[PDB]
Each structure stands twice: as structure tokens, then as C-alpha cells.
């Protein structure tokens, strides 16, 4: 049973065997390649950083977004550790140029951040801040306990469960309001009326039926 | 015309010291992080936060 249109087959069987979209590149949770491309060029354009020097800054940004959250209300400066000192890059271009949201941009960094948590847990106990806020008592699921994890089909079901529990604990029935006050503040019409030296009051031309009786 | 330059100037002054512009002190904005947006002549661009709008 294959779909018909005017007696003609709607589908191409031959292309259907040779189609391997690898399940991640056609997701909605991950932003499109052109949008991440425009984001990566626009944040480089606003930092004045050469193309050689930019991936370092992305390595720093990924880690910072592991620790803190990739909410769209992110403001201020984000910190990268150069040796012992801190550098403070502005957050403005990052949330400014992220076109769908910052989550779908940062979901490109998902498995690399996932392996970075494991690389940091090789040396020392490294649980990301977001897992410390969500109060995940496990510790071995700290590899999955960050803000922008993109749930692939090749993840454990216990990791699915942990991520969905952290997401549902995090949202707490957020009523997504659509509008806030609008900029058309003027609710009263113009006082187009002409003032005159002949006028009696500013708000009154000339008493006309007053009988003084 | 001076909108985004003033916007970045508030951030540059908040790097050093707590610098909230007077207009935000008159409007009694309790936030402090939105002092970057709390001036009289801000030109609301599409690339601004919705909380700043």
C-alpha cells in the first residue's frame, strides 16, 4: 500500500533505500546548519577574532555553557580561564545572534560536551553546576546533566529519564506569556482645540446659556 | 543614532563600578542588570532581549 495521486505513485522507492539522514541533522531541537553558520560568523564578526583563534573561544564558551545555563535571559559576561587569570567576553553577541534560540545553537556542542564531562571525570570529581542545581544524586549521570543535551536515539534509557526529570523539574509549569505592554502608550486623543484671548476658561470658551437668575 | 553606543557605554561603565544611569534611578528599576537598557533614548532593535523590551 503505497500512496497514489491521480493513479500515479507519490513516492520514489529508489531514493528511499539510499537515504541516510543520521537522525540528528533533520531534528527540530538542533538548529539548521545555515543558522548555526550565521551565528558562528556573526559572533566572530562582533569579537574581532581571527579564524585560527576562534575555536579556542568556542572551547571556552562550551564549558561555560556546561556550567551555567543557555537560557535566553543570559546577560553579562562569560568567563574563560586563561592560565590562572580570567577573561570576560561579552554575552551580548551570543544570545543576540542565536536565531532559533541559544538552545538549538548549543545543541551542536552536545556530544562534545558529553565527552568533555567524561574527560573531566577521569581526573577529578567534576559534576556540572546545572546538575548541582537540579540536585542529581547519581554522579555517574553528570555526563548527561547539562542544560543543552540533545537526546539522541543512542543514549541510555536511564539517561533519557534523568534528562526528562531535570527538564520537568526545571520548567515548573512556565506559563509562556505572549505579549507585554505595547508601545502605543497614547490612549487619549489630541486636544486639537484652539485657545483664544476671548475665551473664558482654558477648558471653556464662553458660558452661553447662563441666566444669572 | 547614539543608541547602541550608549548601550555599550553603560556596560563599559558597569565593568568598573556600579553605574546605573539617572533615568533608571528616576524610573526606580530595581534590576540593575537592565541598566544597560534603562536610558531615555533607547532604540528598540529586533536583536534585544524580550525582558529588555
Amino acid at each position: 500500500r503505497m500512496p497514489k495521486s491521480k493513479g500515479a505513485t507519490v513516492l520514489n522507492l529508489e531514493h528511499l533505500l539510499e537515504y541516510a539522514p543520521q537522525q540528528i541533522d533533520i531534528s527540530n531541537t538542533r538548529a539548521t546548519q545555515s543558522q548555526f553558520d550565521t551565528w558562528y560568523e556573526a559572533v566572530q564578526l562582533a569579537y574581532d577574532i581571527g579564524e585560527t583563534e576562534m575555536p579556542t573561544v568556542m572551547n571556552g564558551l562550551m564549558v561555560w555553557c556546561i556550567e551555567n545555563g543557555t537560557s535566553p535571559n543570559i546577560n553579562g559576561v562569560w568567563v574563560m580561564m586563561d592560565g590562572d587569570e580570567q577573561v570576560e567576553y561579552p554575552l551580548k553577541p551570543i544570545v543576540e545572534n542565536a536565531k532559533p534560540t541559544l538552545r538549538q545553537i548549543m545543541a551542536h556542542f552536545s556530544d562534545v560536551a558529553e565527552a568533555y564531562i567524561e574527560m573531566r571525570n577521569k581526573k577529578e570529581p567534576y559534576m556540572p553546576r546545572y546538575g548541582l542545581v537540579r540536585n542529581l544524586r547519581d554522579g555517574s549521570l553528570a555526563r548527561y546533566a547539562f542544560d543543552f543535551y540533545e537526546v539522541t536515539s543512542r543514549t541510555p534509557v536511564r539517561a533519557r529519564e534523568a534528562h526528562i526529570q531535570m527538564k520537568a523539574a526545571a520548567l515548573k509549569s512556565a506559563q509562556s506569556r505572549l505579549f507585554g505592554l505595547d508601545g502605543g502608550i497614547s490612549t487619549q486623543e489630541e486636544n486639537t482645540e484652539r485657545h483664544t484671548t476671548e475665551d473664558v476658561s482654558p477648558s471653556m470658551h464662553t458660558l452661553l446659556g447662563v441666566k444669572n437668575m | 543614532h547614539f543608541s547602541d553606543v550608549a548601550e555599550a557605554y553603560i556596560e563599559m561603565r558597569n565593568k568598573k563600578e556600579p553605574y546605573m544611569p539617572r533615568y533608571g534611578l528616576v524610573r526606580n528599576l530595581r534590576d540593575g542588570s537592565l541598566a544597560r537598557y534603562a536610558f531615555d533614548f533607547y532604540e528598540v532593535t529586533s536583536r534585544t532581549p524580550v525582558r529588555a523590551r
Binding site: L45, A46, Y47, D48, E53, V57, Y89 | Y9, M12
Partner: peptide, 11 residues
């Protein structure tokens, strides 16, 4: 790791 300016150019 480059230091950054606040009112840097190309804006």
C-alpha cells in the same frame, strides 16, 4: 586567548 574590548569597532 584574546582579551576583548567593550566598544570595539566593526559595529
Amino acid at each position: 586567548v584574546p582579551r576583548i574590548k567593550a566598544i570595539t569597532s566593526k559595529m
